[PDB]
Amino acid sequence: MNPFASLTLTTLIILTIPIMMSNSNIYKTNLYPNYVKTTVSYAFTLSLVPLLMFMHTGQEMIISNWHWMTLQTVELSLSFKMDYFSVMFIPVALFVTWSIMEFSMWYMHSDPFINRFFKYLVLFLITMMILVTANNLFQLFIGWEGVGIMSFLLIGWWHGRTDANTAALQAILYNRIGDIGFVLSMAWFLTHSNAWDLQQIFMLNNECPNMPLIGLLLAAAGKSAQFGLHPWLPSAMEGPTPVSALLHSSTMVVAGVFLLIRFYPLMETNKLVQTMTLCLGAITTLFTALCAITQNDIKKIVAFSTSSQLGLMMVTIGINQPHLAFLHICM
Amino acid sequence: MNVLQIVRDHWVHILVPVGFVFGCYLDRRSDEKLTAFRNKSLLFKRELRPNEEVTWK
Amino acid sequence: IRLQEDPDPEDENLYEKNPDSHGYDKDPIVDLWNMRVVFFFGFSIVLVLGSTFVAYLPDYRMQEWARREAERLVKYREANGLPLMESNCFDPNKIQLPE
Amino acid sequence: DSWDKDVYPEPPRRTPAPAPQTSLPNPVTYLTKIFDLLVDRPVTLAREFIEQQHAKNRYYYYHREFRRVPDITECEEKDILCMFEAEMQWRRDYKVDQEIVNIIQERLKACQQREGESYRQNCAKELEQFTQVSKAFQDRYSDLGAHYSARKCLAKQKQRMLAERKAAKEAAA
Amino acid sequence: DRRFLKLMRFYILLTGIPVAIGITLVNVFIGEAELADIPEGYVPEHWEYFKHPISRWIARTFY
Amino acid sequence: MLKIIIPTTMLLPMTWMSKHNMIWINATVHSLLISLISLSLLNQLGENSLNFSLTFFSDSLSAPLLVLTTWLLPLMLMASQSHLSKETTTRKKLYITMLILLQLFLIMTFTATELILFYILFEATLVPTLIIITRWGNQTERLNAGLYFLFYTLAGSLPLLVALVYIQNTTGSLNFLIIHYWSHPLSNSWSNIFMWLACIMAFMVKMPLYGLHLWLPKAHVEAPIAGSMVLAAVLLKLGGYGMMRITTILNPLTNYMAYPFLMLSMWGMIMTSSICLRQTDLKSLIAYSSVSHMALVIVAIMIQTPWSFMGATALMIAHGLTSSMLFCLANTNYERVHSRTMILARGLQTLLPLMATWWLMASLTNLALPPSINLIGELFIITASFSWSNITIILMGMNMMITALYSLYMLITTQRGKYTHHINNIKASFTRENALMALHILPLLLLTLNPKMILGPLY
Amino acid sequence: HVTKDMFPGPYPKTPEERAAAAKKYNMRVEDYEPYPDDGMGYGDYPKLPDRSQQERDPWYDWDHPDLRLNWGEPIHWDLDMYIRNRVDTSPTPV
Amino acid sequence: IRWTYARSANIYPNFRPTPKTSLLGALFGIGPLFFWYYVFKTDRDKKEKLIQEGKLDQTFNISY
Amino acid sequence: MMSGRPGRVPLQFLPNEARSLPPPKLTDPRLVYMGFLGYCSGLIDNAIRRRPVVSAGLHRQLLYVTSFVFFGYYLLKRQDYMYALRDHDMFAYVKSHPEDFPEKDKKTYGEILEEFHPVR
Incomplete structure (x- = not known):
């Protein structure tokens, strides 16, 4: 317990250091993309070690250090729950971003703001890591909106791109539709369960999570581009090609799915709510793939496939395959 | 070095600081007006030590 | 033209005759002095030392005392076989109920 | 630790001592070893400076006390002196009662991770202990x-x- | 726009690093205090019931 | 509080006999000093309000508003420097006098002990703003703007005066401490409903409430910029500070007659936010945005829950910093383009880098990114409203979604896109308005670090 | 530079005032057609074609190609939801 | 300026008390408030009717 | 509420009976505010007369403040006299009529049935 949890805290702060150097205007804007390479590759390098003891003894814990709000009966503090899902996803996420922005250095080089560009991928990375390394829904909400507004800015990378602005406008709009269920779950947990941290909610034995489960389902539906909340994910392809090999490639879209497996202790309780997931996931698999079957693009088709895939793992969540779904996401 | 202008320019600049200390003078001209129950609330009924002769001022 | 009025003067830009100015006023020497003093007072001790003042304020609403006193009678309830906290804030014996 | 198990009960920790029968030696063991003696060692002696400096000039801070005053039940109507004392006494008791709920939630939450997947069967004692406190809290200060x-x-x-009282007479029948 | 940004950090750090140095120095040259049982014969002053000496100093001089 | 009152009134002689060019420097520096002195008011005990004097008292509700006013005062001082250059010195000092007088009345209002004394300075703020709105406005309609703003507030103010003096004859005192401590249940007698009513529409007319808000779009979009911030940032919140006060006695009536105003508000922000999305003038959006944000506060106070009150306080302070920023932001564009049409100056990111940021998180704080205090106030309202009624969630959740819809819309229709090639007067962004936005935004993130200071006395 | 005659007037009834608003609003006499007089307050503003900015030809030398508008020409009362980013009225093959 | 002035100023001078306008004024006026009044009143009455005899799920709710 | 009370000698600013009351203190904020009224009146005088406002003829200014404090002083002495008379007939009539102001016993909070309205 001397390694692992401490190492994770080291990993999630060293990724912020590029931003701290960026805002300090002491960094050199020329090699900053390459400087970003070294940070992400190193942050990936220190991301392997937290796996080692999890393979060894499988220890899991929650880090809650600095108490933010007391709010009478409900104390609030920044808190990361490192479990199976979070621990091995960080190297998977870290390895992906290091490679994709390695490619993006050669690709995304004919633009004046490549320094500002690579900084934005960094600002996605800590928001996504805030989401996955979370212990109460509010921090996950912090990452949820952070990546959503991050997509808004990244999709609209060309502020003169009218289509990208519309896609970004649709990008957050559908994402805010998802948060309506997040807010619904947020209110129910603070009222019926009177808790925000993940641990208490699961073990309070909320054997009537009907409305929260719908709220959780709606949240994942918006984030994971379910039917009715799908078209923003294809729309995000309008931005630069690396941006399509980014947040919406396979990173941000699965955040809602990660929320679904997160709440699997209570997710299995209601067979009804258990059902409607694999339904909507199944329709996405057919419909989005059907659109990609007769189509005239490359990124769009594989974007439609991603939504079809994004419909796949949470179908398994609908059939109570949480860990298997998470394995599928990383694959 | 032009004694007239230096005071004339900055003589208005002390107006707020003197108001502050004046403001701090008279708001605590108020406590001795509202003495009433001193060390008389049983929650803070503290026996006066011989060294001092007052709870607060 | 019954109303003899001067034409609308074009708005002046602070940087035409004073490119290095700070957009505060016309005369330069006080324009820097204005900029020096607002940039001083604003983001300095009003902001920084103000932040330290609130962050390092003394006990605000006494929650450290709450925890310290809470731990004391948490032990007391757990010591002499008592529930951590009863259902009546005020002792039901002193309250003289009607009828 | 400063806190004691009567306030925060920490379940005892056991260590499943390993047995690496595999040909390859474990990579974790010296990975934690190197992490120990390249990071912990500089900060241990640095902390020794911090702890020794605290001993050089150790001032003191005490705990604020509160002498109990008559309750609102024994306080006088339209009398602003006594019932203000009871008012403030009641508010402090509310703040302490809020923190009692905080501790029992902290103890309950600590139980869940300690038992891991066995939280369902091994956290019932802490859950019911919080449950009766919360129920007592609801009739105490809620609404x-x-x-x-x-x-x-x-x-x-x-x-x-x-x-x-009416229910008790009803139960008497 | 760059004149902006260096003016902030200069003026922010003008009192930024000194108080940052002062707080860190206090934490490693005076530290904090420890709990007591209120030794009899001497009532704690208004600033005695506080952990951080800066917080004690703030209450000492102003509150 | 005279340690704040005395220096504040001392700003008048100093600003009235300073040099013809030092009025801006002198007023800005010492107002900031007052803000630093006012920062000491953040200290609050457990539940005892700081009772400095017989006629002045403060708690964790008054001080955050108090600091907001004092911190704000230099912000219009720097904002007004732009368009007040072309004026005579005597009239310029008159402008400063109105702002300082407005500040002085604000501090006395929040620190007032009894309701009648609170009422006197509360309303007294109408006079300084009436001169500011009318005398120094820009367009013909400002004359109709002042009357609309004056009568609307006054029409509700007078019934409160009758009810307030009626309190004194019945209870025996109007002091807030005694009223709350000697609080008694209010009967449901038909007279008591109007008794309840007369103490309400005074606070909700200036909130503003749905229906009784038309002065808000007719004043804020039309007042001078300096008057625009103080109107939106604090003056609307004067109803909030009063309503937490007056609700201590008006119980248990609030259970019944909250309804006709509740869904009047609950359908309100969704309706108002829809209007914001479909504006044509820039400042009209933020004005319509302000009432939309103010609407959730009305529900927060009226529902009478501790969580909502904390959410009411946090949203109150957060909205003030926000609405001041966007109004300042619109003023910056209006000055160069000499209009406030939204699509007149779309696509200015390519020419305004730092502004495009100042658009960015100002709108994001309007979108209320986590963990900005806007959500902390907003989310607390949601939990309180949900505990009151589950079906509440869809409405204001849909509202904050249509709130999200427009809150990027001017970002798209002012910064995103292509410049207008005929426009050639967008000069280098002056540090004055530039640094103005910095002083607006940094306290927002600074308060985000330690929000525990702005949830009011219920925290 | 501004006057009532070129300001938007009341609802036009007589054909001469239809021509009067025509020169003010910068169309021809036959190109002026105000909204229905149902009391909605539209008045003298003409009912321009229910089209969107996406329908506009990109190749034409627009004075505002960012939204495909030209200086001086009349614009639509409901232009705001009928611009390129917002709802579009362009034909669909199906 | 013709669009803004007609969209902001010249609606009331061209406004008419036409029965149609009053009709759309009525159904979009008191209509929705009475809609949500009944909905929330019905929800509150249906919600409240079980609190006074203990038929709700409130055991783990001591925050409000 | 007082022009009909017995012994009220007409057209007599301050009764000899009133001299038993504390004279207003010179520092009295009510009194010093009336001095400011004299100061403000002086500035108004130079404004209409087109004079150097603050720095104009001090003799005209100093007369205004000196006059206002004086007529302020006796008005403040008459202030408390009438209020004292209001508080004099207050208790003498209370003692003279005891039965219409009965003494209320104590019925402390522990016994009242006062209910709690559920704020939900």
């Missing part, structure tokens, strides 16, 4: 309103106590 006061809680306590 009072944003403008809660000692007299408002006393009315709630009297309302609950007269309802059960």
Whole structure:
């Protein structure tokens, strides 16, 4: 317990250091993309070690250090729950971003703001890591909106791109539709369960999570581009090609799915709510793939496939395959 | 070095600081007006030590 | 033209005759002095030392005392076989109920 | 630790001592070893400076006390002196009662991770202990309103106590 | 726009690093205090019931 | 509080006999000093309000508003420097006098002990703003703007005066401490409903409430910029500070007659936010945005829950910093383009880098990114409203979604896109308005670090 | 530079005032057609074609190609939801 | 300026008390408030009717 | 509420009976505010007369403040006299009529049935 949890805290702060150097205007804007390479590759390098003891003894814990709000009966503090899902996803996420922005250095080089560009991928990375390394829904909400507004800015990378602005406008709009269920779950947990941290909610034995489960389902539906909340994910392809090999490639879209497996202790309780997931996931698999079957693009088709895939793992969540779904996401 | 202008320019600049200390003078001209129950609330009924002769001022 | 009025003067830009100015006023020497003093007072001790003042304020609403006193009678309830906290804030014996 | 198990009960920790029968030696063991003696060692002696500097000049801070005053029940109507004392006493008791709920939630939450997947069967004791505290809290301070006061809680306590008094006579039949 | 940004950090750090140095120095040259049982014969002053000496100093001089 | 009152009134002689060019420097520096002195008011005990004097008292509700006013005062001082250059010195000092007088009345209002004394300075703020709105406005309609703003507030103010003096004859005192401590249940007698009513529409007319808000779009979009911030940032919140006060006695009536105003508000922000999305003038959006944000506060106070009150306080302070920023932001564009049409100056990111940021998180704080205090106030309202009624969630959740819809819309229709090639007067962004936005935004993130200071006395 | 005659007037009834608003609003006499007089307050503003900015030809030398508008020409009362980013009225093959 | 002035100023001078306008004024006026009044009143009455005898799920709710 | 009370000698500013009351203190904020009224009146005088406002003829200014404090002083002495008379007939009539102001016993909070309205 001397390694692992401490190492994770080291990993999630060293990724912020590029931003701290960026805002300090002491960094050199020329090699900053390459400087970003070294940070992400190193942050990936220190991301392997937290796996080692999890393979060894499988220890899991929650880090809650600095108490933010007391709010009478409900104390609030920044808190990361490192479990199976979070621990091995960080190297998977870290390895992906290091490679994709390695490619993006050669690709995304004919633009004046490549320094500002690579900084934005960094600002996605800590928001996504805030989401996955979370212990109460509010921090996950912090990452949820952070990546959503991050997509808004990244999709609209060309502020003169009218289509990208519309896609970004649709990008957050559908994402805010998802948060309506997040807010619904947020209110129910603070009222019926009177808790925000993940641990208490699961073990309070909320054997009537009907409305929260719908709220959780709606949240994942918006984030994971379910039917009715799908078209923003294809729309995000309008931005630069690396941006399509980014947040919406396979990173941000699965955040809602990660929320679904997160709440699997209570997710299995209601067979009804258990059902409607694999339904909507199944329709996405057919419909989005059907659109990609007769189509005239490359990124769009594989974007439609991603939504079809994004419909796949949470179908398994609908059939109570949480860990298997998470394995599928990383694959 | 032009004694007239230096005071004339900055003589208005002390107006707020003197108001502050004046403001701090008279708001605590108020406590001795509202003495009433001193060390008389049983929650803070503290026996006066011989060294001092007052709870607060 | 019954109303003899001067034409609308074009708005002046602070940087035409004073490119290095700070957009505060016309005369330069006080324009820097204005900029020096607002940039001083604003983001300095009003902001920084103000932040330290609130962050390092003394006990605000006494929650450290709450925890310290809470731990004391948490032990007391757990010591002499008592529930951590009863259902009546005020002792039901002193309250003289009607009828 | 400064806190004791009577306040925060920490379940005892056991260590499943390994047995690496595999040909390859474990990579974790020296990975934690190197992490120990390249990071912990500089900060251990650095902390020794911090602990020794605290001993060089150790001042003191005490705990604020509160002498109990008559309750609102024994306080006088329209008398602003005594019932203010009871009011403030009631508000402090509310703050302590809020923190009692905080501790029992902290103890309960600590239980869940300690038992891991066995939280369902091995956290019932802490859950019911919090449950009765929360139920006692609900009839104590809940539903009072944003403008809660000692007299408002006393009315709630009297309302609950007269309802059960009527129920007790009903149960007597 | 760059004149902006260096003016902030200069003026922010003008009192930024000194108080940052002062707080860190206090934490490693005076530290904090420890709990007591209120030794009899001497009532704690208004600033005694506090952990951080800066917080004690703030209450000492102003509150 | 005279340690704040005395220096504040001392700003008048100093600003009235300073040099013809030092009025801006002198007023800005010492107002900031007052803000630093006012920062000491953040200290609050457990539940005892700081009772400095017989006629002045403060708690965790008054001080955050108090600091907001004092911190704000230099912000219009720097904002007004732009368009007040072309004026005579005597009239310029008159402008400063109105702002300082407005500040002085604000501090006395929040620190007032009894309701009648609170009422006198509360309303007294109408006079300084009436001169500011009318005398120094820009367009013909400002004359109709002042009357609309004056009568609307006054029409509700007078019934409160009758009810307030009626309190004194019945209870025996109007002091807030005694009223709350001697609080008694209010009967449901038909007279008591109007008794309840007369103490309400005074606070909700200036909130503003849905229906009784038309002065808000007719004043804020039309007042001078300096008057625009103080109107939106604090003056609307004067109803909030009063309503937490007056609700201590008006119980248990609030259970019944909250309804006709509740869904009047609950359908309100969704309706108002829809209007914001479909504006044509820039400042009209933020004005319509302000009432939309103010609407959730009305529900927060009226529902009478401790969580909502904390959410009411946090949203109150957060909205003030926000609405001041966007109004300042619109003023910056209006000055160069000499209009406030939204699509007149779309696509200015390519020419305004730092502004495009100042658009960015100002709108994001309007979108209320986590963990900005806007959500902390907003989310607390949601939990309180949900505990009151589950079906509440869809409405204001849909509202904050249509709130999200427009809150990027001017970002798209002012910064995103292509410049207008005929426009050639967008000069280098002056540090004055530039640094103005910095002083707006940094306290927002600074308060985000330690929000525990702005949830009011219920925290 | 501004006057009532070129300001938007009341609802036009007589054909001469239809021509009067025509020169003010910068169309021809036959190109002026105000909204229905149902009391909605539209008045003298003409009912321009229910089209969107996406329908506009990109190749034409627009004075505002960012939204495909030209200086001086009349614009639509409901232009705001009928611009390129917002709802579009362009034909669909199906 | 013709669009803004007609979209902001010249609606009331061209406004008419036409029965149609009053009709759309009525159904979009008091209509929705009475809609949500009944909905929330019905929800509150249906919600409240079980609190006074203990038929709700409130055991783990001591925050409000 | 007082022009009909017995012994009220007409057209007599301050009764000899009133001299038993504390004279207003010179520092009295009510009194010093009336001095400011004299100061403000002086500035108004130079404004209409087109004079150097603050720095204009001090003799005209100093007369205004000196006059206002004086007529302020006796008005403040008459202030408390009438209020004292209001508080004099207050208690003498209370003692003279005891039965219409009965003494209320104590019925402390522990016994009142006052209810709690559920704020939900």
